[PDB]
Design a protein around this ligand. Sequence first.
Ligand SMILES: [K+]
Lengths: 185, 51
Amino acid sequence: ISGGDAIYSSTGRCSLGFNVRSGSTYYFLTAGHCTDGATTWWANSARTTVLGTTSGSSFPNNDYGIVRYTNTTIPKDGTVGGQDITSAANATVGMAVTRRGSTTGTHSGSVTALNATVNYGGGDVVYGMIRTNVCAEPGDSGGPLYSGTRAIGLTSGGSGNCSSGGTTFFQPVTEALSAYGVSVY
Amino acid sequence: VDCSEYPKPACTDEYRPLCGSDNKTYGNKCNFCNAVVESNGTLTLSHFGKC
Ligand SMILES: [K+]
């Protein structure tokens, strides 16, 4: 299971962000809005394959959550699709980035702005977000945003779609890595 | 679903579909309600789940 693949909770579907780990403990990052209120996470709609359970969730204000792997057999590739990821890095205006999500597949684009404020309503505001011209649709939430072999962020939301084009805001993954004391592998 | 608070400038991309009257599956409530607005009140909910 890698970056971009589907993940299911009791509530609905999201996309796995990146495989991370501390010491000998494996987890995976994803969106906080998806980790909010979830406990268990399965690898399939059928909920037959358990992946693990929620370990932290920060949403709103930020938009990242972490899941502890409890599945022993599942392979945990440190990839995005079969794209090797070897480092984390700060987004920059003009950077070329690629996103991968369980509903849309891979789409690329550029970072158009930093520190963006996203107001999803009813007090769910998130701050310090990366803005891009990359599209995303329902189910792609939490998927990885990368550049070459660099992890850059996690899909949070935006507007538009992939047919007509849109805007998508991501949570800097460095932030999440630090808060949890984990790292990409 | 109540769409009065809409429209909203943005929507999170989580999936929990709704079936609109245009026979299209909306990937999520926020998406669905923004379409209801954009249709100027003409789009309705057929049922929860995919179409
Ligand atoms: K979208």
